Structure formats: C-alpha cells, structure tokens
C-alpha cells in the first residue's frame, strides 16, 4: 500500500519510520533498507538518528527519486537497460553531432545564425547541453510532449522554440536508434510501467519489501502515479512533513471537493479532517473558481506555494491512504504563536478595518519584552554580522543549558 | 513646479540667479523655469550671532587681478574661518537652524563643502584641519593598501 | 582525475566522432568542479554554518539566517526563455523562486526554540541604506500586526505594531569596540578583548 | 566610561564529534576525507627507480 | 513648448512622456504614484488600457543603490495604499486622492496584495541589469553565451 | 600495457583460498555479497584511549604491541565503510582490500611482514571496530542471531 503520512515535525515522521522497522523485522540477506531522499543532509540526519534508537544503522540506501523510479522500471518491465540512453549527459553529446546537420533548415534558422558568426564548439556545446538539459526535464514534466514530437506532431499552445526543439527531439530519437541504443526513455516507459503493474493483479514480481520517502516536500505528478501503481505490491511509506494540519491547497471541480471531504486516520487511532462542516468549503475557502481565497494564514499563503502543489497532488491519488500525525503547538512564544498559526491555518493579523477594531490594541496577543525567540538584527557588514551572531549564540548558550552546539 | 526640500530664501536666490539672462544654461533646448518653494517650509530660516542670514551669501576677494593660486589659499582660509565661526557660535546657541519657532545649534554634521577635485578637497581639509575642525572627504578613492 | 575521466567517458558513450578542442573539456571540468560541494562535516563537530538546501529541512533548536537582504536571499536565475515549460506552468512544476521561498518557511517551521534573523542595513562606504529581503519583511509585518507590548494596550493598530517591530529589530554598531556594546542589557558583548578601547582607557 | 563585558559562566565540558577510525590516522587527511569520502586513505607517497 | 505643470494622477499613461523633475521636486514621490496608478490601472482617460503586474512595470535607474531605494520605497507605498483600501479611509494626502479614483477598494486591496508579495521580482533594474537580462533571454538574437 | 599483468593479477586474487574450507571470492554470487557497507555506531559515555587499550590487550595477541591510546576522549558516532561483507552459507565475513606497499617484492607480504604493518598502521583497531559494527548489524537484522 502507498501510505502517506502528514506530520508537523520531521521527528514524529522519523518516529513512524523507526517503528515500521522495529515491527516487521524485514528480511535480512543483506537486503538494503530503502529510503528515498533528496539531500545528503537528510541521509546523514537519518543515519545518525537511526543508529541511536537502534544501536546502529548499516545498509540503508538513499536513492534519489528519479534514480528509484528507473530502478524499478528495470525490475518490472522486460529488458530495460540500467541507465537510460537519454540521460542528460549523453544527450548533450548526441545533440552536438546532430545540431550541426540540422542547421540550414529554416526551422533552425535561429540557431543557424547564432552558431555561425564565430565559435570553436563553444556555442555548440552550451546549446547541445542547455538543450539536453531541457529534454531531460520535459521527460518528467510533459512526458507526453515527446511521444508527440517523435512522430512530428506539435502541441497547440506552446511558444516558438518548439519549432526547433520538436524536430530536434524527433531527430535525437531517430539518431540514437541507428546508433543501436535502447530506445527507452523515462516518458515512453512510465505508462507501460503502470499498466503492467496496475494489471497483472497477481503479485510483486520480486521488488523490495518496504520503502520510505523522507524529507521530500515535492515530487513529479508522474513519479507519484508511478509510486501509486507500485504501492499495490510493495509497501510505500511516504513521510511528508506538512506545515498545516487542515487542507490548504486549491480545488478543481466543485465536484472534486466532496471527494476530498474524506478523512485521514491517525497512524494508530482513527479518522480526522478540516473544520466547519460545509461552511468551510463554502465561505471563501476555494472561492470563485480559483483555490483557497483565504488559505487562512497569510505566511503559509505567499510562501508555501511549492507545498500547495505537492499536497494537492497527494490528495488526488486513489490507491493512497493518507493519515494524520500532526502534533500541537501551544502558543507561549512569539515563535510558537506564529508556528501555531501556520499549523491551525489561522490569521491573527489585525488590519483595523473599522474604528472599533483599529482603536484598541489588546485584541492582538500580548508580547512579553522578555521574549527572545525570533529576533531581528541589522548590521553594517558580513564581518560585523558574524561577530554579532557569535555573541548572541554565546548568550543563548549560556541562557539555557541542554543546548549543545550541534543544535544550532 | 513645487520644490519641497528647500527654504524659500534659497529657492528665491537660485531662481533669481538662473533667471538673469535668457537661456542661462545656454541651450534653447534646456530652458530654466523657476520653481515654487513648498509651504511646509515657509518657516525655514538660519540665524547667526543675532538675526537671520541671507539664503545666499557671496564672498568677494579684493583687487583687480587674481590667479588660480590665490583664489584657493585665500578662499579655503576664508571658508575655514566661517565654518568654525558657525560651529563655535553653535555651541553657544547663537547659530540656529529654525523652522519657524523651533530651533537647533548647527553641528559639523550640518555643514557641507562641495568641491571639484581631490586636491580642492585637500586644500579645504587642510585649512579646516588648521583650525582643529575635523572633516571627512566623502569622495575618497584611495585604498587601504597605500596607507 | 574523476571528473576528467567522467567528462570523457560520457562523451565516448554517446559515440562522438569528431575531435574535441581542449577548451571544451577545461570549461566543463571547471563547471563540474564549481558545482562539486564539500559538506562531510555537516553533523559532527557542532554549529553548522551553511546555505539553504532544498529538500533538507531538519529541525534544530536554534536557527540563524544571515544576509537576508533584498536581492540576496530569494536567489534568482531566469529560465532559458526557450524553456517552453516555464511559460505554460502546471501543478508539478518547480522553480528556484518557489524553492527558496518555501525554504524560508521551512526554517520558521523547523526552528524549535529560537529564530535568529539578520541582514545588512547599509554598506560601510556611501552609507546609503539597504533593505531586508521581502521575506523577512513579511515576517515582522505579521508579528507587528498580531502582537502588542504589555505597556501599549490602548493606543492603536499601527502604533502598537511599530513598537513591536521596533522592539524585536536590533540596530547594531559599526565597530565591535563601540561602547554601546558594553553597557548593560541587550547583547552585551562577550568579547572583553575590546573593552579597554571601548572605555577610552588607552594611553596615547 | 562606565562599561564592562559580559563574562559567560558556562564551560566547554564535553565534545560531541563523529569520528571514524580517524582517532587513529594522524591528520594530513584534512579536507581529504571531505573531498573524497572513499579515497584510498590508507595509501600515500611517491615512486622512483623500481 | 513650455511644459504642463505635471499632475501625477492626471498624467496620460499612454506612450512617450518627458518629465522634468527640477532640483528636489519629489521625482521619487512622482514615480511611486505613477507606479501604483499603473498597477491598479487607475486614472481615467489618462489611464492605461488594462492593469499591469509588478513584473510588467519596467523601471530603470542608473545606480545600484538607486534600484534598491526605488524598490524599497515602492513596496512600502503598496503596503500602505493597500491597507488604506481595507480601511476605505486614509488620512494622509496622496493616498486619499487615490482612493477617490478607486472604484472597488475591495478589489484593489486584493490586486495590491499580490503586488506586495511580488516585489522580490519587481522589474526595477539598472540600465545595465535590464540589458544583460533581455540579452540572456533572447540569446539567439544577441549571439550571447548562456 | 598493464592489462596482461592486471587481468592476471585480479584473477590470482579471486581464486585465492581465504581461510580453509573452500571460501574464495570467485565462489561468491551476488546474493551473498554486500559491497561498501556504511555504518554508524553511536558511542555514548566518552571513549577513553587508555580504557580501551586494556581489554584490547587481553583478547588480541596482535594488539600486544601496546603503543595505542593515540587518540583522546570522544562522544558521539562512529562512521565506517566496509569494503566487503559476504556469506559462505553458514557465516558472514569482513573483507578489506588494502593496496599498500612499495616494499620491493613478495618477501614483504609474508604472514610476518603483514602482521607488522598491521600494528604499524594500527589496522587492528579497524578490525575490532568494523566487526563490532557487523555484530550490531547482524544481530539487528538476523532476528535471534549468535556470534
Ligand atoms: Ca580498504
């Protein structure tokens, strides 16, 4: 099953991962425990965190998402070469032997001149790359675009450049064939992957036992689906650390809304969800046609832009089984207050829309001149700015003990 | 049309000067149209050892002839003198920048000497420094490496 | 030697016929070398000074942000212009703007006890004033709009707000030996080294 | 001049580090185990007329 | 010949206009004003076809410290005029003459909210920043290196 | 021109008899191999160089050459890479390929010479540490395992 865990702090999510491992002993024939991660930092944080609450951490693989998906392709599907022949690198080279021929086409007239005036394979190589770089990207965001261009078809609504990219892509694919290389990209292979998994409703061909996804606040639409289908024969524990407990994303059809009015189960107890019966969906939340016209908290509003997308795509899955793991934030600090707002999706900002509201000031929260969490410092220069910090780090170290330096 | 930021006495003096001849900026395409001084500033005035001083004051050297040499050794001296003159008379509350019925003693931070080149600056800095009046050349480019 | 072999093998893989001019390789060896980052000491001998890495939002008791100036933090770079995908966006898409802004949020979210925010207020030359990264502006602005100091309970929204932002904002001195750094109270320096000069206790 | 500088009453005490059979091998590997985490750190030197 | 005494709020926001900001005439107060008008498409006959976004109002100064201050002054004016839209009441010059020209204080407040959070991308560069920017975008035409 | 020597060198090491009954790299299939294992052994309660030298002595005849305790108190973790860990369907092992010497020829790679460089580089520690890790790991994985 593709289990999706929404938590407040990476700790609780690390906790659930800690427990998932103690529970099912997992096999042990040197079978590497798997954790998809997107930054060495995490890998190190997990490694150490886990070596503690266990006495050691040994195998664990930290494949990047993209490298995982393709790992499976090789497993599920029939005869897939390890490492695509369309990887960003090789692409740049193959594109360098091609472009020169593709010039003087009317199509590539724009590049045709850009590459003439002068060079020594300098302009040709940057292009061959920025190109290969783009293709590598289109192969994840808009993987249908290629299947289109491969047959010469264009796509209604794209800027120019498709004028040359489209042919170029068809051109790269044909060339790579003559070279005699596995035609398989990442786009012509995701659909099949799902189909053969979504069907063959029998059993897991021989993939891994359980898989985790830690600290990745974003994944491509296609990688999720790919994982979804995979989460039918494999246990996929995707640990997503979410800044708000309620749903703060946008909405599609006022028909898709009630399909969201479902519920997330506590990993151990049972069911929860967004506040105010209907009124919520109603009111302004997901107003007019747009998305959450209020997104409650204004900070989570203008910043979490990346979050919305990922949360919205997670709640558009079917084989999913999301569940709550949000821990509270008692509002004693300015930090905790703000942190709390963001959690409960509430705005405590006061604009003073009316003389009643605007004249008094005790409606807002009491500060506490003594509160030092969340401080602001204006300095004259980087040196100065660093000398000052060293002082305050010293201070706040003195302040409360227990605070070792690694905590900063 | 409105010149916020400045004193009426000033705007009047500047306008008068640049209204003398026609095409003061001598270029029919760059005409000079006077400007109305802002009301919120109508109160601005500068008093010294007695009464309010003119927005603009011209100091004229004597004689018939005058070399670029003289008109510097002597002008810097003069300028220098008038600065300490405002400053000292400032600590004694006799040099005041006033907005109607408000006031304050002029401080070094209030005086400013515009100049055309490094030298000129030095020329000034020296006559000043000769009167223990500390200064700083805001347009200094020298590097810490030839100190 | 690794990168060099890499760069070459890769080119051989895609079967490149024509020859290669050194420049090509040097310029690439350079770039790679420019991107290869060293961060092996990330979580051993404490106090980690680093950059805001996307997809690495670990929780720390203390979180300090330095150089959060306008034009400096929300790190930029404009899409190629011929990156079709950037003109016609979709839910899955990603860009630095978005990544960084959501990073600043991950900080606040991850700061368990103290959030330290710092930026440069003026260049030590023309002395002109600089500005805090909009992101930081959006934070104190929210603080001030939802808080009030004990004293000021009946005065005004804007007025109570100011006093709050002004109260959390701390204007530091140009030199470390400035006496203000040695009176009593808010961040008295822990550097006695400068004390004597701060107290004009010199002997010409 | 009525000043003075805060003086911290805490002490260094313990030191948390993450060693690795490096508590052995004396330095020189400074930044070495950093640039190449899997470098054959166990070897080093020059060669001649052999 | 001889220019019209400029009245910011009534300046026709449509093609070619030369403004002479004499010595300390509030050239900055003017620019900001004109900036807001544009954002909210205000004015009237002397207004602009439609409303523009922060990333559509190109402003070029010569100095680096210039664009910083210009960019700073604007985020502020926006945050205010926007607030002064939620209160539908302002008691500070400029702004009031602006709200009188606004037809839906509730919308401008929204429109403005975006302009606020958009400022970290305001099209306010230097002559030089504008150039290498257009250049590096239209690389093919300029024959520039990426 | 190193291929012959090398292609012949590799094999010679592969089909090389490890300890006794069978065991030779060439007999190890994928499923029984785990290359480059990275472990993390938490270490609380300061690890004193001296305190460890004592027990290391009693059990190891190699660490009898007691210069040790060349490091100082450390609390925290313990990184470490294991070149290879495999299983001869019965037990698990620790392999560490070590390319060293310039020490002329053969005579320097004798059971004596080797056990010499061992203390020379104090690799002995690597042993105890590494195994202590594989211990912790195997015990962790193999639900109910014995040394
Ligand atoms: Ca080894």
How would you characterize the overall build of this protein?
This is part of a larger assembly, with two copies of chain A and four copies of chain B. Chain A has 408 residues and is of the alpha/beta class. Chain A is 41% helix and 8% strand. The longest helix of chain A is centred in the last third of the chain and has 18 residues, at 382-399. Chain A starts with a strand and ends in a 9-residue tail after the last helix. Chain B is built from three helices and four strands, in the order βαββαβα. Chain B has helices at residues 8-17, 70-91, 118-129; strands at 2-3, 36-37, 44-48, 95-99. In chain B, strands 1-2 form a two-stranded parallel ribbon. A two-stranded antiparallel ribbon of chain B has the order 3-4. In chain B, helix 2 crosses helix 3 (118-129). The longest helix of chain B is centred in the middle third of the chain and has 22 residues, at 70-91. Chain B is globular, with a radius of gyration of 18 Å. Chains in contact: A-C, A-D, A-E, A-F, B-E, C-D, C-E, D-F. Chains A and C meet through helix 2, helix 4, helix 6, helix 11 and helix 12 of A and helix 1, helix 2, strand 1, helix 3 and helix 4 of C. The complex binds calcium ion (CA). The site of calcium ion (CA) has 4 residues of chain F, from loops. Chain F: The active site is at residue 96. Chain F: Heterotrimer of RecB, RecC and RecD. All subunits contribute to DNA-binding. The C-terminus interacts with RecA. Interacts with YgbT (Cas1). Chain F: Belongs to the helicase family. UvrD subfamily. Chain F: Mg(2+) binds at residues 83, 96-97.
